Amino acid sequence: SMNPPPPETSNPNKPKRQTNQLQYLLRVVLKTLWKHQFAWPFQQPVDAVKLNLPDYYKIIKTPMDMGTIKKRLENNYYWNAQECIQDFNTMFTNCYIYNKPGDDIVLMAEALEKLFLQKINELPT
Ligand SMILES: Cc1nnc2ccc(N(C)Cc3ccc(F)c(F)c3)nn12
């Protein structure tokens, strides 16, 4: 049930950038989603040893979570809003891939995805 190293939250040879949309993704999108009653499974990388999911990283090869996204936004790791939005979408699709329709955690990810899309529908200019 080995855990791989968590996804990087900095990369010295990757260029950094800051935009109004990336500041909004941290201040409004991430920090509001974080407080949702169903955010807690997604606030840190999946710990296969703690959670007893020894096949999690046998299935999920591009893991992602909101704790990683938060640190990436705080580091100015992303070039643009779309790069950050792809990490949220990877986090949701990983949940759907590892589990099955109707599972409690899938119902959680479905509700968070809807709220996420509602908030990114309109971004600052
Ligand atoms: C499965 C699975 N797939 N991705 C993840 C991420 C986190 C995660 N935890 C914390 C355990 C858990 C199990 C069932 C749940 F209903 C739930 F809310 C949470 N489990 N999980």
Curated annotation (Swiss-Prot):
UniProt feature coiled coil, ranges: none
UniProt-annotated location(s): Nucleus; Chromosome
Post-translational modification comment from the UniProt entry: Phosphorylation by CK2 disrupt the intramolecular binding between the bromo domain 2 and the NPS region and promotes binding between the NPS and the BID regions, leading to activate the protein and promote binding to acetylated histones. In absence of phosphorylation, BRD4 does not localize to p53/TP53 target gene promoters, phosphorylation promoting recruitment to p53/TP53 target promoters.
Tissue: Ubiquitously expressed.
Involvement in disease: Cornelia de Lange syndrome 6: A form of Cornelia de Lange syndrome, a clinically heterogeneous developmental disorder associated with malformations affecting multiple systems. It is characterized by facial dysmorphisms, abnormal hands and feet, growth delay, cognitive retardation, hirsutism, gastroesophageal dysfunction and cardiac, ophthalmologic and genitourinary anomalies. CDLS6 inheritance is autosomal dominant. A chromosomal aberration involving BRD4 is found in a rare, aggressive, and lethal carcinoma arising in midline organs of young people. Translocation t(15;19)(q14;p13) with NUTM1 which produces a BRD4-NUTM1 fusion protein.
Free-text comment on this protein's domains from its UniProt entry: The NET domain mediates interaction with a number of chromatin proteins involved in transcription regulation (NSD3, JMJD6, CHD4, GLTSCR1 and ATAD5).
Annotated family: Belongs to the BET family.
Note: JQ1, a thieno-triazolo-1,4-diazepine derivative, and I-BET, a benzodiazepine derivative, have been tested on tumors with success. Treatment with GSK1210151A (I-BET151, a I-BET derivative) has strong effets on mixed lineage leukemia and promotes myeloid differentiation and leukemia stem-cell depletion.
Protein name in the entry: Bromodomain-containing protein 4
Species annotation: Homo sapiens
Biological classification of the source: Eukaryota, Metazoa, Chordata, Craniata, Vertebrata
Residues of the full protein shown: 44 to 166 of 1362
